[PDB]
From a paper:
[name] is a 185 kDa modular protein that localizes exclusively at the M-band, where anti-parallel dimers cross link myosin filaments. In addition to a mechanical role, [name] is also needed for the integration of obscurin and its smaller [name] homolog at the M-band (Fukuzawa et al., 2008).
Using a matrix microseeding (MMS) approach (D'Arcy et al., 2014), we successfully crystallized the OL3:My4LMy5 complex and solved its structure at the 3.1 Å resolution. While the [name] My4 domain and its C-terminal linker L as well as [name] OL3 are well defined in the structure, the entire [name] My5 domain is invisible in electron density maps. The OL3:My4L complex is present as a (OL3:My4L)2 dimer of heterodimers in the crystal. Individual OL3:My4L complexes display a bent dumbbell-shaped structure, in which the [name] L linker extends away from the My4 domain integrating within the OL3 fold. LH leads the C-terminal portion of L, an 18-amino-acid-long extended stretch divided into two β-strands (LS′ and LS″) that integrate within the OL3 Ig fold. Thus, OL3A is a complex trans-complemented hybrid I/I∗-set Ig fold. In the case of OL3:My4L, this binding mode provides a surprisingly high mechanical stability to the complex (∼135 pN), a rupture force significantly higher than that required to unfold OL3 alone (∼85 pN) and quantitatively similar to that exhibited by the [name] C-terminal dimer (∼137 pN) (Berkemeier et al., 2011) required for myosin crosslinking.
Author numbering:
A (entry chain N), D (entry chain M): 510 to 632
B (entry chain P): 242 to 339
C (entry chain O): 243 to 339
């Protein structure tokens, strides 16, 4: 089956993140029995399958989030024959309550300045 | 506040024309010298003929993907880590097909 | 955010007299920190001879054109925002022909 | 009188900083009665005169330092026919006890990552 489209995050919390997606183009090969959702902690390259059996409902709550860490998501469609390739991955989603994300986003940090690199140029 | 760009905020989307090169520049600070690596769509990016990575003279690390194809679209992440911690920056590449 | 050449001794970069000298410095901060240059404890102001602009690669640039022996000294890049201020320093020496 | 040369810091503390300098080239205009020392907090452009009357001894302890702030220094020679121009300013000197300066200098800092700047090129 064709890969699902437009993976986005509807809602996000320390506890769980609810992610949705657009259904792929109807190939008529075998009806889509459901979908598998995979999560990855942004830094690592470890992709883990969130649901053990397929889900039909095109919005899904993801659990098992380490608080304060940011995650990306992909979806794979599944039919009778097997599983398709993954969707284009989502924008990163941080596992924070909305107020803490707002707080961090609008927080000042003292400036840092790099070494001054001096070079000669020719008039 | 080492939060890193495009991780908490939504990453920027930069469009590139198919067949042309795309340069990704990212400056990083840390003691000790933080070791950096690139990722694409949650997969590690590895030096190829097509994909090249070097540190630009005058500071920051560069990733260069040559001869962009539609399939090259995705989330590009610059991960940097040292003994004290790790921080990521992210960005999205879209490809303009002729 | 300690800043280069303030706790450590600043680097000394030699330039040939009559040539241009480019000073590049990258700075991070939320909010966007306002930056200013100083020379020998005096504020540096945009002249025909002295130019200041922010590079397309990011980072702020100071360019002193047609270096003279008198242009020697401690060049400091000061950057400040609501939360704080941090400086970087460097020393310019001039090679007379 | 000619400006003094090579303004250097001999010793540095939270309490005071001892600064030395080389005497200028000797002239038959008038004997050097002493010197004036000026300090400036690195960020500001405010120069303050440390000693009210001249000092002959070519090393001088500077007080009135705000702890943890970095300072630069210049010296002016003075004779019977007035005060000369200032010396080339010193390397910055932080008002910290030696152990605290060592501690700060060898302290690890978590990495910070800048925005990724994407640009188009062609061969």
């Amino acid at each position: 089956p064709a890969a699902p489209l437009d993976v986005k995050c509807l809602e996000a919390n320390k506890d769980y993140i609810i992610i949705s997606w657009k259904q792929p183009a109807v190939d008529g090969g075998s009806p889509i029995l459901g979908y598998f959702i995979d999560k990855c902690e942004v830094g690592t390259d470890s992709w883990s399958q969130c649901n053990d059996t397929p889900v039909k409902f095109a919005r899904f709550p993801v659990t098992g989030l380490i608080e304060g860490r940011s995650y990306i998501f992909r979806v794979r469609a599944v039919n009778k024959m097997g599983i398709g390739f993954p969707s284009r991955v989502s924008e990163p989603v941080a596992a924070l309550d909305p107020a803490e994300k707002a707080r961090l986003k609008s927080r000042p940090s003292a400036p840092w300045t790099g070494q001054i690199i001096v070079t000669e140029e020719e008039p | 506040g080492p939060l890193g760009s495009g991780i908490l905020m939504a990453p920027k989307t930069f469009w590139v024309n198919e067949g042309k090169h795309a340069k990704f520049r990212c400056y990083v600070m840390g003691k000790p010298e933080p070791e950096i690596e690139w990722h694409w769509e949650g997969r590690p990016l590895l030096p190829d003929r097509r994909r090249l990575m070097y540190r630009d003279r005058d500071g920051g690390f560069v990733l260069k993907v040559l001869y962009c194809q539609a399939k090259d679209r995705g989330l590009y992440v610059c991960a940097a880590r040292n003994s004290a911690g790790q921080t990521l920056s992210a960005v999205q590449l879209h490809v303009k097909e002729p």
